[PDB]
Design a protein around this ligand. Structure first.
Ligand SMILES: O=C(O)c1ccc2c(c1)nc(Nc1cccc(Cl)c1)c1ccncc12
Length: 327
C-alpha cells in the first residue's frame, strides 16, 4: 500500500509526554461558573458551534463564548485538552474558562477577546512590512503548537485574529487540531477547501505538522499577490487541479509516486498536463510593492507538494524574508 511518512521534526514529542497530556478522552473537565458570563451579541456559527461576544461580570472584561453544538462528542475533550496544553504559548488564543450552558446543555468555552479587523478589510491594507511582521507572529504560534505535539489543521485567514492597533495576533479555533503520533493515520476531511494540502487532496492519511505550512503558504500567496484565495477551486477535485496549474503535473506525479499513492481516477479527465510556473507570473503593478525575491523564495519553499520538503515553522523563521522585521 502507501509508503509511510514521519514528521521531520518534533516526531516523538507525545511519546515522551505523560499519557495524560495526549489522552484527551480521559480528560476530566474543570467547570467554571456559568453565571459569570453574560452574552452580548452573536458573532457567528460554524457546523459545530455558535460564537458570541460576552462580558465577564466578575471583571467587566469583554470575552468570547463558543457554545459547542451537540455534535461529535469526542471532539469536545480534544479541543479542550489542546487549548489547555497550549495555554500561555506565543500567540495562542487563551481559554479563560469552560462552563456548562443551561440552554444548549453543552460546554461553552470562554476565550480572551481580541479586538480584530476582519481579514477581508485588513488584507486590502497590509503593507509589505505588515505581511512580514504578521507572518512571523503566525510562525511563533505554529512552531509552538508543533513543538507541543499538536497540528492545527485549519490555518486560514479567519482563524488568525489580528488586532491591527496593537499589532497583536492570536491563532484561534483549535476545534480541528490533533495530536501528532508517528505512524498515525488521520482524517483527510480537515481544513477549508482553499487551504487543504495536496496530502489531503490525494487522500494520504499519514500527514503531520507540515500540513499547516501548506495552509500558511496559501495565506502568504493570497497576501503578497493580493488574490484571496490564491488557489480557488470549485470543489476538492478542482482544488488539486488549480494547484497543479501552478506547481505543475510532473511534480504532482512525482509526489504520489514517492508515497505509492494513486489519484482518484476521476482526475483522468480533468487534470491535464501543466508545466510548473515561475512565481513572477503572478506579479503585476497592483501587487508588486508586496513582492520581493525573498518573499517569492519563502513562498516557493512553503508550497511544495511533498509535505516532507516544506519548510518547518522554525526553519521558516530563519528565512531572509524576515530579516527586515524588527525583533
Ligand atoms: O473558536 C475559537 O477558538 C474562537 C476563539 C476566539 C474568537 C473566536 C473563536 N471568534 C471570534 N469572532 C468571530 C467572528 C465571526 C464569526 C465567528 Cl463564528 C466568530 C472572536 C472575536 C474576538 N475575539 C476572539 C474571537
Amino acid at each position: 500500500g502507501p509508503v509511510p511518512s514521519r514528521a521531520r521534526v518534533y516526531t516523538d514529542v507525545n511519546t515522551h509526554r505523560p499519557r495524560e497530556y495526549w489522552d484527551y478522552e480521559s480528560h476530566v473537565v474543570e467547570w467554571g461558573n456559568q453565571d459569570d458570563y453574560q452574552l452580548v451579541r452573536k458573532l457567528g456559527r460554524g457546523k459545530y458551534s455558535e460564537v458570541f461576544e460576552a462580558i465577564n461580570i466578575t471583571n467587566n472584561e469583554k470575552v468570547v463564548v463558543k457554545i459547542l453544538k451537540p455534535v461529535k462528542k469526542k471532539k469536545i475533550k480534544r479541543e479542550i485538552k489542546i487549548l489547555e496544553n497550549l495555554r500561555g504559548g506565543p500567540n495562542i488564543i487563551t481559554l479563560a474558562d469552560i462552563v456548562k450552558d443551561p440552554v444548549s446543555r453543552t460546554p461553552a468555552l470562554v476565550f480572551e477577546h481580541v479586538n480584530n479587523t476582519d481579514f477581508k478589510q485588513l488584507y486590502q491594507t497590509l503593507t509589505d512590512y505588515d505581511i512580514r511582521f504578521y507572518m512571523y507572529e503566525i510562525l511563533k504560534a505554529l512552531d509552538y503548537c508543533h513543538s507541543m505535539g499538536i497540528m492545527h489543521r485549519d490555518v486560514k485567514p479567519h482563524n488568525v485574529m489580528i488586532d491591527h492597533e496593537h499589532r497583536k495576533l492570536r491563532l484561534i479555533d483549535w476545534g480541528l487540531a490533533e495530536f501528532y503520533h508517528p505512524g498515525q493515520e488521520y482524517n483527510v476531511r480537515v481544513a477549508s477547501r482553499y487551504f487543504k494540502g495536496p496530502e489531503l487532496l490525494v487522500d494520504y492519511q499519514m500527514y503531520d505538522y507540515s500540513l499547516d505550512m501548506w495552509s500558511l503558504g496559501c495565506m502568504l500567496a493570497s497576501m503578497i499577490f493580493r488574490k484571496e484565495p490564491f488557489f480557488h477551486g470549485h470543489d476538492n477535485y478542482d482544488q488539486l487541479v488549480r494547484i497543479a496549474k501552478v506547481l505543475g503535473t510532473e511534480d504532482l506525479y512525482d509526489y504520489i509516486d514517492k508515497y505509492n499513492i494513486e489519484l482518484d481516477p476521476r482526475f483522468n479527465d480533468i487534470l491535464g498536463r501543466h508545466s510548473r510556473k515561475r512565481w513572477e507570473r503572478f506579479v503585476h503593478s497592483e501587487n508588486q510593492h508586496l513582492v520581493s525575491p525573498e518573499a517569492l523564495d519563502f513562498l516557493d519553499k512553503l508550497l511544495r507538494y511533498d509535505h516532507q520538503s516544506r519548510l518547518t515553522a522554525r526553519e521558516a523563521m530563519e528565512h531572509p524574508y524576515f530579516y527586515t522585521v524588527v525583533k
